[PDB]
Coordinates of C-alpha atoms and ligand atoms in Angstrom, one line a residue:
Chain Q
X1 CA 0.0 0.0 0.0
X2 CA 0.9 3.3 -0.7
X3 CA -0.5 5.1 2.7
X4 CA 2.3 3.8 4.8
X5 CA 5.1 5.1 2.1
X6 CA 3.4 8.2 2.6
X7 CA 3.6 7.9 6.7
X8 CA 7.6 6.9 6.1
X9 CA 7.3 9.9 4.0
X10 CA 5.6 11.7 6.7
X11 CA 7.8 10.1 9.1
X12 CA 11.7 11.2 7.5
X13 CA 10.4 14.8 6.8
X14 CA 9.8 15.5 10.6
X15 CA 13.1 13.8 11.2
X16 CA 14.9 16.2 8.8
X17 CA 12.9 19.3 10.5
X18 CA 14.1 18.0 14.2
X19 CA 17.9 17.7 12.8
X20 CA 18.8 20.3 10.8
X21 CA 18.7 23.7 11.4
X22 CA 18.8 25.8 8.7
X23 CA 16.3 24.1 5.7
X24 CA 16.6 24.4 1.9
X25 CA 13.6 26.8 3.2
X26 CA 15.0 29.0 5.2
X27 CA 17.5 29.1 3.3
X28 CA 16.2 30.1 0.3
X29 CA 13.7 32.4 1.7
X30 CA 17.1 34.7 2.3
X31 CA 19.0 34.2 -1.2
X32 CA 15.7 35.1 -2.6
X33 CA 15.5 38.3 -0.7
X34 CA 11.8 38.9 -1.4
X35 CA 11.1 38.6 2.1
X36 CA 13.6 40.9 3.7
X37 CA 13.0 39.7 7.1
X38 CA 16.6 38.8 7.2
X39 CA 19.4 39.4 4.9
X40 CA 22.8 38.2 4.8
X41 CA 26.3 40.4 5.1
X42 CA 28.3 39.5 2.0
X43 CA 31.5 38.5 2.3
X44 CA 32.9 39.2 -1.4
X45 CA 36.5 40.9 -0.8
X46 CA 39.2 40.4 1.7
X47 CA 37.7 43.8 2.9
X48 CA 34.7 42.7 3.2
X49 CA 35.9 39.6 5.4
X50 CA 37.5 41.5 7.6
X51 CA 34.4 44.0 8.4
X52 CA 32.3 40.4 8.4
X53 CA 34.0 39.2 11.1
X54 CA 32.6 42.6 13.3
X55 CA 29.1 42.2 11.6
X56 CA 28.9 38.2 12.2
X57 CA 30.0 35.6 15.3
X58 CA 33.8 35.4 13.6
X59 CA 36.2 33.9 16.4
X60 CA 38.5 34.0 13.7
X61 CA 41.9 36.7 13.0
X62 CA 40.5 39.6 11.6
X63 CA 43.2 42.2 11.0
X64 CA 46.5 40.8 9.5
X65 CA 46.9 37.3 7.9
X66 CA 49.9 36.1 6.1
X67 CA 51.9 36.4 9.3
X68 CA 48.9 35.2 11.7
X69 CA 47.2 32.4 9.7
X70 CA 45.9 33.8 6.2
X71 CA 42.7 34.3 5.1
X72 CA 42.4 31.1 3.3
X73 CA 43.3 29.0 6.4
X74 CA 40.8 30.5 8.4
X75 CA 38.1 30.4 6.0
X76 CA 39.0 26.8 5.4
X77 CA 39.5 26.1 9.1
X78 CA 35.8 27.7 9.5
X79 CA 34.9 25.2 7.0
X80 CA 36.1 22.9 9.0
X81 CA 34.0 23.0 11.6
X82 CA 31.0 23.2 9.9
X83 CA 31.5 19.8 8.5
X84 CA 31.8 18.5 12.0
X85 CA 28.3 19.8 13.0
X86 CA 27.4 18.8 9.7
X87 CA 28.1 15.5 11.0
X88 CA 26.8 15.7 14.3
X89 CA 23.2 16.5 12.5
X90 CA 23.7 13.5 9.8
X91 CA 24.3 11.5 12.3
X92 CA 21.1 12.1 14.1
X93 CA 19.1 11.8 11.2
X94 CA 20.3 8.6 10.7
X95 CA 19.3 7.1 13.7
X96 CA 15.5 8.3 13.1
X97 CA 15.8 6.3 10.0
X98 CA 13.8 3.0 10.5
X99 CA 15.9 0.1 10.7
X100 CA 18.9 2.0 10.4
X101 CA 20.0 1.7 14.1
X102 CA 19.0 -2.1 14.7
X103 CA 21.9 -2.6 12.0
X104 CA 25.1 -4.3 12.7
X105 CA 26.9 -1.7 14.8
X106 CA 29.7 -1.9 12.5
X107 CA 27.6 -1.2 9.3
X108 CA 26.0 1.7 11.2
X109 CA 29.9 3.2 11.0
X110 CA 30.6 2.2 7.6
X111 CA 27.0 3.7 6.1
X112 CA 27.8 7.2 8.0
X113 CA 31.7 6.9 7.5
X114 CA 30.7 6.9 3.4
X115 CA 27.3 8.9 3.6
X116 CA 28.3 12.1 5.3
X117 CA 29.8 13.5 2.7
X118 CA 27.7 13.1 -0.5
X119 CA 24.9 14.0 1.8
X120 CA 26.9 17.2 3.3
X121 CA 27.7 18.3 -0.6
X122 CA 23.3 17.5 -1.1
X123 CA 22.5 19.7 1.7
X124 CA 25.0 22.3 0.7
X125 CA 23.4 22.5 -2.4
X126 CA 20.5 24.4 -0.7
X127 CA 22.3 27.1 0.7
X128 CA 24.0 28.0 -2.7
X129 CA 23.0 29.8 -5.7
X130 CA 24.9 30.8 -8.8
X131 CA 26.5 33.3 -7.2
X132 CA 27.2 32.1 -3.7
X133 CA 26.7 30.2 -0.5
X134 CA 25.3 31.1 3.1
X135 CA 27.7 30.8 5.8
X136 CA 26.9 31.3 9.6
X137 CA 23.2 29.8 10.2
X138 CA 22.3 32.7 6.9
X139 CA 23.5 35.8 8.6
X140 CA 26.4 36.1 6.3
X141 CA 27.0 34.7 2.4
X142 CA 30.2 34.5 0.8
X143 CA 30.5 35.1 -2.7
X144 CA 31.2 31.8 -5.5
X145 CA 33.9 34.8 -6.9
X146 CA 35.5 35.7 -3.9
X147 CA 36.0 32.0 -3.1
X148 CA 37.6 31.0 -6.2
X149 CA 40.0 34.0 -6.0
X150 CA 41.6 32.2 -3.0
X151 CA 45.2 30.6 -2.6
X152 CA 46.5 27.6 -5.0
X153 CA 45.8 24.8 -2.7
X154 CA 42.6 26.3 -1.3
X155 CA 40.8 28.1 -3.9
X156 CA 39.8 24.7 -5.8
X157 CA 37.6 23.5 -3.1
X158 CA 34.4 25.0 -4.0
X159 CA 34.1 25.5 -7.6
X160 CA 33.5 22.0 -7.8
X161 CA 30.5 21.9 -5.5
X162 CA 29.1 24.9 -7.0
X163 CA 29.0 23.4 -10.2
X164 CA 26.8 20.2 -8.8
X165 CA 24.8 22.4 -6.8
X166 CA 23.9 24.3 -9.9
X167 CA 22.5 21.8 -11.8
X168 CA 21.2 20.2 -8.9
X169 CA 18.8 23.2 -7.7
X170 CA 18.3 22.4 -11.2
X171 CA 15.8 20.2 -10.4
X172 CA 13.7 22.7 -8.1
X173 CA 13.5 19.7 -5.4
X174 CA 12.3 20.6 -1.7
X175 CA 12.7 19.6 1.8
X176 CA 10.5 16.7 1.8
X177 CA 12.5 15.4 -1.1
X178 CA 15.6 15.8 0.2
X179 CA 14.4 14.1 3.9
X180 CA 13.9 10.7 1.9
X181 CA 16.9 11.1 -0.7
X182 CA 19.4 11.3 2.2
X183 CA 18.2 8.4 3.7
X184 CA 18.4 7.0 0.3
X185 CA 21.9 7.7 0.5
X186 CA 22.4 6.6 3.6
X187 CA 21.3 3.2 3.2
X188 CA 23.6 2.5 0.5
X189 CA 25.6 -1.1 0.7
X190 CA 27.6 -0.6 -2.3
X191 CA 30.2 0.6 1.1
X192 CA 33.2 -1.4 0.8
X193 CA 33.5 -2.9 4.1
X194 CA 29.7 -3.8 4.9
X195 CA 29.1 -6.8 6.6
X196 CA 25.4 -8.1 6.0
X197 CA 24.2 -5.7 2.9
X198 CA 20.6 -7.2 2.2
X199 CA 19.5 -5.8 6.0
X200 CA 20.4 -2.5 4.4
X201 CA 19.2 -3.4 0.7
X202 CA 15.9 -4.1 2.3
X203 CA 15.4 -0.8 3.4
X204 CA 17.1 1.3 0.8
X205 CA 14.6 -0.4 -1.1
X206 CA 11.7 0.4 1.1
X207 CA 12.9 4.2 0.9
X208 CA 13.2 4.5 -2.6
X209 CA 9.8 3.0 -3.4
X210 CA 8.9 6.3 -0.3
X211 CA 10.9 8.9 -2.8
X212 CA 9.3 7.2 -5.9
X213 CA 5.9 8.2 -4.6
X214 CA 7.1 11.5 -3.3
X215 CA 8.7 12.6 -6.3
X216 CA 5.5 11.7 -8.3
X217 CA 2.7 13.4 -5.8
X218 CA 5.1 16.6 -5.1
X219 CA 6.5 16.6 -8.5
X220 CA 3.3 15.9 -11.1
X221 CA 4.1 17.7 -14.3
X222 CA 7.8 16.3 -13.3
X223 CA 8.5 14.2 -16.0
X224 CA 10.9 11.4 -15.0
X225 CA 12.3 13.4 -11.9
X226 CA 13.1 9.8 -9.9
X227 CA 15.0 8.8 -12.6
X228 CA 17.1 11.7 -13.2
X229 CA 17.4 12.1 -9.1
X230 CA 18.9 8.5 -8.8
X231 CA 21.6 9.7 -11.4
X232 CA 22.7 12.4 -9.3
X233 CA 24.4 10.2 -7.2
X234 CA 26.9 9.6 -9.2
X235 CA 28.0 13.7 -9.2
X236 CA 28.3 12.9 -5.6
X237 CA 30.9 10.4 -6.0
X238 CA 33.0 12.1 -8.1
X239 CA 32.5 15.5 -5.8
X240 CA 33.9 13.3 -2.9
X241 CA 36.9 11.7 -4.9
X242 CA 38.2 14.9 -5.8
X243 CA 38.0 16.0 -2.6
X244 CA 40.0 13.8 -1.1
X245 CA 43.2 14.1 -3.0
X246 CA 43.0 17.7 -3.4
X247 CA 42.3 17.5 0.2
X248 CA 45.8 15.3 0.7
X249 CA 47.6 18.1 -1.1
X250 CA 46.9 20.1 1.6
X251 CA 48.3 17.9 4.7
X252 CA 51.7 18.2 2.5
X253 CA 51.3 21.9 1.7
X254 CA 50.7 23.3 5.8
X255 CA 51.8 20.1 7.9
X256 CA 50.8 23.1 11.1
X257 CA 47.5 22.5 9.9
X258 CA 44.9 19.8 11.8
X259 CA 42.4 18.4 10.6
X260 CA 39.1 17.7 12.4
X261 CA 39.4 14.1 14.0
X262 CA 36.4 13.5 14.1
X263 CA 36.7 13.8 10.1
X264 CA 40.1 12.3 9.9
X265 CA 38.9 9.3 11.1
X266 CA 35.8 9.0 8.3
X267 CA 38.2 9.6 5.4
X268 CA 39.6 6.4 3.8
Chain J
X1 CA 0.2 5.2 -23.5
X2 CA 1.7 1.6 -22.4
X3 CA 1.2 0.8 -25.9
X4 CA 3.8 3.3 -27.8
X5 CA 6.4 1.9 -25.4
X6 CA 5.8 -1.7 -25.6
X7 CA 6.5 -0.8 -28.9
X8 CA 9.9 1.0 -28.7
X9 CA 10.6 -1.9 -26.4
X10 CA 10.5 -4.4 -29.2
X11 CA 11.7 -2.1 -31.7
X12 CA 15.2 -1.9 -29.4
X13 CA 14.8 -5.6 -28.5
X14 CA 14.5 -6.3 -32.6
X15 CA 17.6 -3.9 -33.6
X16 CA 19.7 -4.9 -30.5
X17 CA 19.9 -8.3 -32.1
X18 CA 20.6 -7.6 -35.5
X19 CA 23.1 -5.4 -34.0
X20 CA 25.1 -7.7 -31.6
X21 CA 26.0 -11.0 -33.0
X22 CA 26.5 -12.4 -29.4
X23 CA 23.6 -12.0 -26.9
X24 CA 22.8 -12.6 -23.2
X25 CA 21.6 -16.2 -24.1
X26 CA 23.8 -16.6 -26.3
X27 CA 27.0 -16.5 -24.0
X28 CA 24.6 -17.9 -20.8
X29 CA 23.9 -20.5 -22.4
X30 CA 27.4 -21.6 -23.6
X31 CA 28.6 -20.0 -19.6
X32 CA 28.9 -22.3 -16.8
X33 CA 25.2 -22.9 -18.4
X34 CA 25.1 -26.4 -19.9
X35 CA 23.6 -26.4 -23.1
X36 CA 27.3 -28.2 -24.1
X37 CA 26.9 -29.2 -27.9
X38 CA 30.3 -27.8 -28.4
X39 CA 32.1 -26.8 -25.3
X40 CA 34.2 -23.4 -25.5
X41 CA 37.9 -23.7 -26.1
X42 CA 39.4 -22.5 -22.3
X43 CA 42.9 -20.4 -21.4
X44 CA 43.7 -21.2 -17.6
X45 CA 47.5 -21.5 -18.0
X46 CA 50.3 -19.8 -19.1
X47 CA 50.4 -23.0 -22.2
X48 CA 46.4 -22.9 -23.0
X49 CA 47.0 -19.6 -23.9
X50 CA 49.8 -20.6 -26.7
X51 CA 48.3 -23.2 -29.0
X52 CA 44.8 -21.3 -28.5
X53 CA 45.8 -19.3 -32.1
X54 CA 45.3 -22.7 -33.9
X55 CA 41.6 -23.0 -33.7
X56 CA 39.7 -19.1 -32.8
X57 CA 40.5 -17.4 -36.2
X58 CA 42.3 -14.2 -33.8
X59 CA 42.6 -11.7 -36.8
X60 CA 45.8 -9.6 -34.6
X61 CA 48.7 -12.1 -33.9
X62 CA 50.3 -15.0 -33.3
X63 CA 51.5 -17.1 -30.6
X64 CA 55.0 -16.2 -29.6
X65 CA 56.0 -15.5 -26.1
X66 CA 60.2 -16.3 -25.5
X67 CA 62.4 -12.6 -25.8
X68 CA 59.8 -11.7 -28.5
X69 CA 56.6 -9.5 -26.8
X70 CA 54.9 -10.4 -24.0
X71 CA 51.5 -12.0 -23.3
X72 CA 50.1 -9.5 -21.3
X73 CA 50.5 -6.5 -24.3
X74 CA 49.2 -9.3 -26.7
X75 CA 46.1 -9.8 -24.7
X76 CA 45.5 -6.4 -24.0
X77 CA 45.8 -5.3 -27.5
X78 CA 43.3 -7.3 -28.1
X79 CA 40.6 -6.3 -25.9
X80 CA 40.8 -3.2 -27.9
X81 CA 40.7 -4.7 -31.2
X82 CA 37.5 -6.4 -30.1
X83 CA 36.4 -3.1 -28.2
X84 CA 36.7 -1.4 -31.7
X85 CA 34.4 -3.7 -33.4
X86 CA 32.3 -3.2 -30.4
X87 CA 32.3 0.6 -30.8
X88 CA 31.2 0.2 -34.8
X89 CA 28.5 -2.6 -33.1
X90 CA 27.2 0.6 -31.2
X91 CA 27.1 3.0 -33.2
X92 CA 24.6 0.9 -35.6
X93 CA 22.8 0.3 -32.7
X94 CA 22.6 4.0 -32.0
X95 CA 21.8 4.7 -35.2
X96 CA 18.4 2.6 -34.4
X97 CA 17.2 4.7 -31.7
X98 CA 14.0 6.7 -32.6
X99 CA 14.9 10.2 -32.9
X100 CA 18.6 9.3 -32.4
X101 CA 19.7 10.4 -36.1
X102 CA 17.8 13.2 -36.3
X103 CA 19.7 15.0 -33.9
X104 CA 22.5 17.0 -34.4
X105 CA 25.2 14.9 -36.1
X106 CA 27.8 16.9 -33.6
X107 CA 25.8 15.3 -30.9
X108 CA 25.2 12.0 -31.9
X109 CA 29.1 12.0 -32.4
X110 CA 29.5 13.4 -28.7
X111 CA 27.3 11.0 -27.1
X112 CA 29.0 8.2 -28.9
X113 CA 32.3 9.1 -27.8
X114 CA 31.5 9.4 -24.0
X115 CA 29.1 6.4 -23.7
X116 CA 30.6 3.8 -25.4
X117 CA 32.8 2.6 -22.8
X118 CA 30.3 2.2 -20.5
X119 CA 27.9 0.0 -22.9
X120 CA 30.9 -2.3 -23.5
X121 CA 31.7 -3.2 -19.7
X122 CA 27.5 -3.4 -19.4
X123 CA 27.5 -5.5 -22.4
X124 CA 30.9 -7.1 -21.2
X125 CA 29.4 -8.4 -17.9
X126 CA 27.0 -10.6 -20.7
X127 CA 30.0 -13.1 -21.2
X128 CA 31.7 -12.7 -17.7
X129 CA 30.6 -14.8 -14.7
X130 CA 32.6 -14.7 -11.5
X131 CA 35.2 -17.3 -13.3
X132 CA 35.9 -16.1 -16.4
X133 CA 35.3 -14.2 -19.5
X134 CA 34.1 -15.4 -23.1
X135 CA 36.1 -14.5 -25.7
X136 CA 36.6 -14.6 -29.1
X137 CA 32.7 -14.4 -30.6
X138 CA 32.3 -16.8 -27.7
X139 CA 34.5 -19.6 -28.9
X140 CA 37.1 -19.3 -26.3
X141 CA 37.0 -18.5 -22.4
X142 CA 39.8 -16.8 -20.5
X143 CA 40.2 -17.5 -16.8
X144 CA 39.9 -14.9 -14.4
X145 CA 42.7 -16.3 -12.5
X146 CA 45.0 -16.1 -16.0
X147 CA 43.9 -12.4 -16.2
X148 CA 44.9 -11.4 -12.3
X149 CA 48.1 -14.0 -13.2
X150 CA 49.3 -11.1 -16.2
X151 CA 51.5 -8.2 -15.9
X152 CA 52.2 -6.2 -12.8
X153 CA 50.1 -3.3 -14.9
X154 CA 48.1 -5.4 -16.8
X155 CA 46.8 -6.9 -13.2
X156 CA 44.5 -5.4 -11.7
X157 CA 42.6 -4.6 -15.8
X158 CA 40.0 -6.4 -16.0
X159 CA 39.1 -7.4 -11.9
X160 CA 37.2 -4.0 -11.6
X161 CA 35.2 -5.4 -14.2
X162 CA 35.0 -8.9 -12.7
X163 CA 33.5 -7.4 -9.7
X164 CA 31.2 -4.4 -11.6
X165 CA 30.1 -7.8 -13.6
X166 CA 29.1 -9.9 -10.7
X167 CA 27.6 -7.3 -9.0
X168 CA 25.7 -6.8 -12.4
X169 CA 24.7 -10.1 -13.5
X170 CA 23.0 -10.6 -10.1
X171 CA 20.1 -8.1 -11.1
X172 CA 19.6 -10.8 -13.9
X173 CA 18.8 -9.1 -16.5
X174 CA 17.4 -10.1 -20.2
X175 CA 18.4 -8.7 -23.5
X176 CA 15.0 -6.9 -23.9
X177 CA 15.8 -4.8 -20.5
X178 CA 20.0 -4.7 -21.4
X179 CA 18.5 -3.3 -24.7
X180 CA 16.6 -0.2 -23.4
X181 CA 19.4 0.0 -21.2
X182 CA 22.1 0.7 -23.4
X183 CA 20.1 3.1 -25.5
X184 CA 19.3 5.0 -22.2
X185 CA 22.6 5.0 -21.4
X186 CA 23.7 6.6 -25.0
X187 CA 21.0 9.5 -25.1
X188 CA 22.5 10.7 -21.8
X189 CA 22.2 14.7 -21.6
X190 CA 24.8 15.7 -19.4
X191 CA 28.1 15.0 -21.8
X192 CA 30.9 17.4 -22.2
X193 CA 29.8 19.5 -25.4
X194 CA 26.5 18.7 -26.4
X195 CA 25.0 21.1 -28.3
X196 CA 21.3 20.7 -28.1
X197 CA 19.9 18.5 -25.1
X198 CA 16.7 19.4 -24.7
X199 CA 16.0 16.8 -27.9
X200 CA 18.1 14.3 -26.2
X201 CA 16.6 14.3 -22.8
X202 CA 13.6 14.2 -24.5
X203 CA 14.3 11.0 -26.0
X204 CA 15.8 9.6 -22.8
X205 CA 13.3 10.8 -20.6
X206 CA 10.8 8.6 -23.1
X207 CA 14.0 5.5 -23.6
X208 CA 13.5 5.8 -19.2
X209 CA 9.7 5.2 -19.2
X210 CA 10.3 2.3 -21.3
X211 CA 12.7 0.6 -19.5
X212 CA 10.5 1.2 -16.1
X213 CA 7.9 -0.8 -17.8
X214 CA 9.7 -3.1 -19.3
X215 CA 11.1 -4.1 -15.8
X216 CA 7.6 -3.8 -14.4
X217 CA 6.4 -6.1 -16.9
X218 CA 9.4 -8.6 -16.5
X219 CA 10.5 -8.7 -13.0
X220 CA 7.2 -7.9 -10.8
X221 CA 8.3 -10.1 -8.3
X222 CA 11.4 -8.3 -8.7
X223 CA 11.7 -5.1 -6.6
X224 CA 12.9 -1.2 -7.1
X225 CA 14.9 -3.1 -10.1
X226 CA 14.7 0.3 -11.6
X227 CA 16.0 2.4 -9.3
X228 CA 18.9 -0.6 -8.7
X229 CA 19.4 -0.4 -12.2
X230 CA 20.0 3.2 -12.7
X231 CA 22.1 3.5 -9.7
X232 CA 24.5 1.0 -11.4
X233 CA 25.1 3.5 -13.9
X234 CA 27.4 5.4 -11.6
X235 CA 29.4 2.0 -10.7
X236 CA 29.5 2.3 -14.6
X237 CA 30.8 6.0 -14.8
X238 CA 33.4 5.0 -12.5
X239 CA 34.4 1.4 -14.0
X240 CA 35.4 3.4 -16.9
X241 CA 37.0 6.8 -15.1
X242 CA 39.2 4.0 -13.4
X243 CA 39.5 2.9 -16.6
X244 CA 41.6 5.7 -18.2
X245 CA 43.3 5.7 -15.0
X246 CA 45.2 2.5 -15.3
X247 CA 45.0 3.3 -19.2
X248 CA 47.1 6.5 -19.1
X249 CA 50.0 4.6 -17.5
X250 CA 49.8 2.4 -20.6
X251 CA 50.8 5.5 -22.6
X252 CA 54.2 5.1 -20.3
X253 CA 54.9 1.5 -21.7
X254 CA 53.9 0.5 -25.2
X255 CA 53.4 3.2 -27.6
X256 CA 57.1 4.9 -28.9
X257 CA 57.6 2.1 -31.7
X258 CA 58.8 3.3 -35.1
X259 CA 56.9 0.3 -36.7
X260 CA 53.2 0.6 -35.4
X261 CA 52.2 4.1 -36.1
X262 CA 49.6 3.0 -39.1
X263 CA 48.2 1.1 -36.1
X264 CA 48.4 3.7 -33.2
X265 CA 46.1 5.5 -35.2
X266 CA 43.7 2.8 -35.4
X267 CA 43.1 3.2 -31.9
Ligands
AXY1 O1 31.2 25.2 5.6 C1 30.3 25.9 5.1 O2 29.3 26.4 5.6 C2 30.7 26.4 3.7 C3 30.4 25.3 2.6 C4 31.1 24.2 2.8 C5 32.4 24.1 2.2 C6 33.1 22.9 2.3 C7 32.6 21.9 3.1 C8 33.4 20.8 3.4 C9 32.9 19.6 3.8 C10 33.7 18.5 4.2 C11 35.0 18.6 4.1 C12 35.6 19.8 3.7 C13 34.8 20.9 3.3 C14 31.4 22.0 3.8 C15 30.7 23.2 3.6 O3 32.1 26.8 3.6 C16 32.4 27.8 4.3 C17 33.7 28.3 4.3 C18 34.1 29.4 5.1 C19 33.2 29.9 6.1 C20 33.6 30.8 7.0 C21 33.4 30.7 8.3 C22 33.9 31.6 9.2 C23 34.6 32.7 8.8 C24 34.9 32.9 7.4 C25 34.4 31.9 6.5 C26 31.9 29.4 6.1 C27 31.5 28.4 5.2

């Protein structure tokens, strides 16, 4: 029957409220600056930075760089963080995901160790826009531009995710949709390293028949949206692999730098 | 209508077979299937290998491994000669595709040249089972373990595909579904250069509602089959990224050889 897709529907959306702060929603309801309740302070120039830092919560060096950890690091250090509380929230969700925490232990690990990320560069795609992406819970924005215009080693780190997120909001998809496709790609068990993968296929598969329905009662005049969805998963991959090495250049580049353990430890 | 795509089902199912010579059956049936009315020749040592040039009319060489090129290269050159019919198999097969020609002949070149890799290793898993792989218009059969026994380079080649291929086969698919498939594969949309997509999603988004019926009407007890099958696309996207990976370092081997240029260019 369809009515109990539709209460797992039901069901993950109110999850994805519950755990995640700022939704493709909110979110958008400040890019599109219609409604003016709140606007963003954007960060577009090294100036700019510097003043954002009085404007927004910035714990971060703002006078002088170079000499007292650079722009770049700091901005990529901020980054850092976020991730982490990015993960902290995944993480949650997760475990509101029937089935998902009656799942070998172990696989529980190995599903969020290669989840988190594809799902961090989906949920990242809500906050961005052509031109830019919302930093700081949407009181600030820092500009694609500005980004790009960064050091050798650091200013390659966005583009990338830009470019998904583009042709992602491409497909106009909202918070109910995302709720069920992160779950979707949570419950993977193509993860190298899973121990009893039909458990996992079982539910993955009861998810996707949820999105299936979703995508058809949200998204009528959609034409095929599912289908095309799915495919997106392989941007992800990609996103991620990239990543990673240009991410190892780094750890040779600045070996004063430290990464996040709790994100050292997911990457392999 | 149900009806329009039953037919473009059939129509796909009627040209992939005119188009490949070998099919799903085909090769199953002569696999670790029985159906043995004349067993395939088999190359599980190092001296099956030699000797296998007498019967399996291989139009690119002859055996000869002492100081005088290596196995490995032989084979390996030879996947590629066979991948080059393959490509010329496709592009008929393309060709057949409703809509297909009519596009610009830019794009129809562009999505030929990015998704033909990945129908070969999807039609590749056809004659592989965990074992081995059929070769030679499915006369012969090369052992996996003779494959992961080759070249230090040459090594890890064609595993990634043994695994992609078991991983595949166990959806157990039939030629009518692998035959939407591939097409849906070729009318991609998001290649590098494509000039006009709207027309080729178009005729995608239509190839996509065919297979989902297909599969509905095929594999009922069979579940989310779809949505498993298009997710295997991106195991395919990387099968053959990886592909170029452990290809490029070919370049650094094999390819500086006064006496081979009129068949560099070839391939
Ligand atoms: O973290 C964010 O919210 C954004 C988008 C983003 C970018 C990259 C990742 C990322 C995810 C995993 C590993 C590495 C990076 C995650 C999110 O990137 C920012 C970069 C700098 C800042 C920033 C914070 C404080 C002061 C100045 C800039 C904010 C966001």
């Amino acid at each position: 029957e369809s009515a109990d897709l539709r209460a797992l529907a039901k069901h993950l959306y109110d999850s994805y409220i519950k755990s995640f702060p700022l939704t493709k929603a909110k979110a958008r309801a400040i890019l599109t600056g219609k409604t003016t309740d709140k606007s963003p302070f954007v960060i577009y120039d090294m100036n700019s930075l510097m003043m954002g830092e009085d404007k927004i919560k910035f714990k971060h060096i703002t006078p002088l760089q170079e000499q007292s950890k650079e722009v770049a690091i700091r901005i990529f250090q901020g980054c850092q963080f976020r991730s982490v509380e990015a993960v902290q929230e995944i993480t949650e969700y997760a475990k509101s995901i029937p089935g998902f925490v009656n799942l070998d232990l172990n696989d529980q690990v190995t599903l969020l160790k290669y989840g988190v990320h594809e799902i961090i560069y989906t949920m990242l795609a809500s906050l961005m826009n052509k031109d830019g992406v919302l930093i700081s819970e949407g009181q600030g924005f820092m500009t694609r531009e500005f980004l790009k215009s960064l050091r050798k080693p650091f200013g390659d780190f966005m583009e990338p995710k830009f470019e998904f997120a583009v042709k992602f909001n491409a497909l106009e998809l909202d918070d109910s949709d995302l709720a069920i496709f992160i779950a979707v790609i949570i419950l993977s068990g193509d993860r190298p390293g899973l121990l009893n993968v039909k458990p996992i296929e079982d539910i993955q598969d009861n998810l996707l028949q949820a999105l299936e329905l979703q995508l058809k009662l949200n998204h009528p005049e959609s034409s095929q949206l599912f289908a095309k969805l799915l495919q997106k998963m392989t941007d992800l991959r990609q996103i991620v692999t990239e990543h990673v090495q240009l991410l190892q250049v780094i750890k040779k580049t600045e070996t004063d730098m430290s990464l996040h353990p709790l994100l050292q430890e997911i990457y392999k």
